[PDB]
Amino acid sequence: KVFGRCELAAAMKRHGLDNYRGYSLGNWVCAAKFESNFNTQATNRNTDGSTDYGILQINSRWWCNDGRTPGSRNLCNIPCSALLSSDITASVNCAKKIVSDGNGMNAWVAWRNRCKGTDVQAWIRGCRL
């Protein structure tokens, strides 16, 4: 499923991401836009044998089990396939653990490269939240 911008914003706001750990809703919407372009089916294979899954591109090396990543840990206790659903609940709950893992939102390279330090409030424009 491909979320509309405000549609995703509402869904995330609904799952408690606005200001979570001090990160405004805009940050999360911006991260999602550049990580997966709001596509819940997005997947990206990495050259290290791992793969990034879903709307927030969570990595199979440490966060979810996809049964084909060497020395993988399943810290979120879920199959990576669950991160490819139309319901973002799984991704958000796992993301909440990642953002608290000692690097803030720097864990998402696309966020760091295209959202960090910018006027992220723009990603919420026109939304009736």
Known binding positions for substrate: 101
Q: Which region, left, alpha or beta, applies to residue 77 given φ > 0 means left and ψ of -120 to 50 means alpha?
A: left
Q: Which residues are annotated as a binding site?
A: 101
Nearest-CA neighbor of 74 among 54, 44, 50, 104?
A: 50
Q: Point out the catalytic residue in the list 48, 52, 66, 87.
A: 52
Residue 48 falls in the annotated catalytic set: no
Residue 35 falls in the annotated catalytic set: yes
Residues 12 and 28: beta-carbon distance below 8 Å: yes
Q: Point out the catalytic residue in the list 18, 35, 87, 119.
A: 35
Residue 82, classified by CB atoms within 10 Å of its CB into exposed (0-12), middle (13-18) or buried (19+), is middle
Catalytically active residues are 35, 52
